Design goal:
six-stranded mixed beta barrel, aspartic-type endopeptidase activity, about 45% strand, Cathepsin D, subunit A, domain 1, mainly beta
């Protein structure tokens, strides 16, 4: 039973620490269920984003070992380029021996420069892994370093502490009620089927169904740009002066509940949740992002939805289990 604490960053970015090499070099990474690769900046990276963050120096790890393999990854926000190498990764109190991870050479762009995080640790299916690189949780399960072939995650609300990723375990301490399990549509992302999206007893969206991934590496609740128009129009969101869609922070009171039906089970989203706010100003947690796929336009269930529902990712039976947090 591994335990990896996470830092809640402005209810927008949840990262955690890891160590790579011997002695171990520390790095803060994002635990991304929307990605499957693990990469940290390296000392052979001259990009403004690596100078800005910690750089893994293989020359100082006695258990490091190289490859000829190049790796490349595209994110809806960042881009990356590097080489693959093996070393021992320390996660949630578990020594992940012979883990293949990438070492950056380029981290192009503006966005990876302003980030409080150094790298990314994907928790999705090896199906979408760049360079067919073995994900961490797969390497843990394979080396029998975890008792169960599942992991669970708890995300903190209002900047509080308490955010955690439980490797090979489930803790009833985090949810109320019973664990509802939903089968996985398509193995790649943490892909689930949504049946509908309601408000006021009205199906404001996702009629006849839609696809959604459960991504802890996305901050807002995401969907096709036309579809969300309907939602923002409904909660009274406004694309303001500076380029944002805020809302009268007091208009939370009137506002009904947006409800998501998954596998026929109702999963409500209270306005205290779908509306982000600083005691100065209120935004919408809904974001339009057209994400085409063979399956269709993806809806992403990000931190707004995950903060309210304790999620279990079961690789054994390929299902996602949900339950309201405590």
């Amino acid at each position: 039973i591994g335990d990896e604490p996470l830092e809640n960053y402005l209810d927008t970015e949840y990262f955690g620490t890891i160590g790579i090499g011997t002695p171990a070099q520390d790095f803060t990474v994002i635990f991304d269920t929307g990605s499957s690769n693990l990469w940290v900046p390296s000392v052979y990276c001259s990009s403004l984003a690596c100078s800005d963050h910690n750089q893994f120096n293989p020359d100082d790890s006695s258990t490091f070992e190289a490859t000829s393999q190049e790796l490349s990854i595209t994110y809806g926000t960042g881009s990356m380029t590097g080489i693959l190498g093996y070393d021992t990764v320390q996660v949630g109190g578990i020594s992940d021996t012979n883990q293949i991870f990438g070492l950056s050479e380029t981290e192009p762009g503006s966005f990876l420069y302003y980030a409080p995080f150094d790298g990314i640790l994907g928790l999705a299916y090896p199906s979408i892994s760049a360079s067919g690189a073995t994900p961490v949780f797969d390497n843990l399960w394979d080396q029998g370093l975890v008792s169960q072939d599942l992991f669970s995650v708890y995300l903190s609300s209002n900047d509080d502490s308490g955010s955690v990723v439980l490797l090979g375990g489930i803790d009833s301490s985090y949810y109320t009620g019973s664990l509802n399990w939903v089968p996985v549509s398509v193995e790649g992302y943490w892909q689930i089927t949504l049946d509908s999206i309601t408000m006021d007893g009205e199906t404001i969206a996702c009629s006849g169904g839609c696809q959604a991934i459960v991504d802890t590496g996305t901050s807002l609740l995401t969907g096709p740009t036309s579809a969300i128009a309907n939602i923002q129009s409904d909660i009274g969101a406004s694309e303001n002066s500076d380029g944002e869609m805020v809302i009268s922070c007091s208009s939370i009171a009137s506002l009904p509940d947006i409800v998501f039906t998954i596998n026929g089970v109702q999963y409500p989203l209270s306005p205290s949740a779908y509306i982000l706010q600083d005691d100065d100003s209120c935004t919408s947690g809904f974001e339009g992002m057209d994400v085409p796929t063979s399956s269709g336009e993806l809806w992403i269930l990000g931190d707004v939805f995950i903060r309210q529902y304790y999620t279990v990712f079961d690789r054994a039976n390929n299902k996602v289990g949900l339950a309201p947090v405590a």
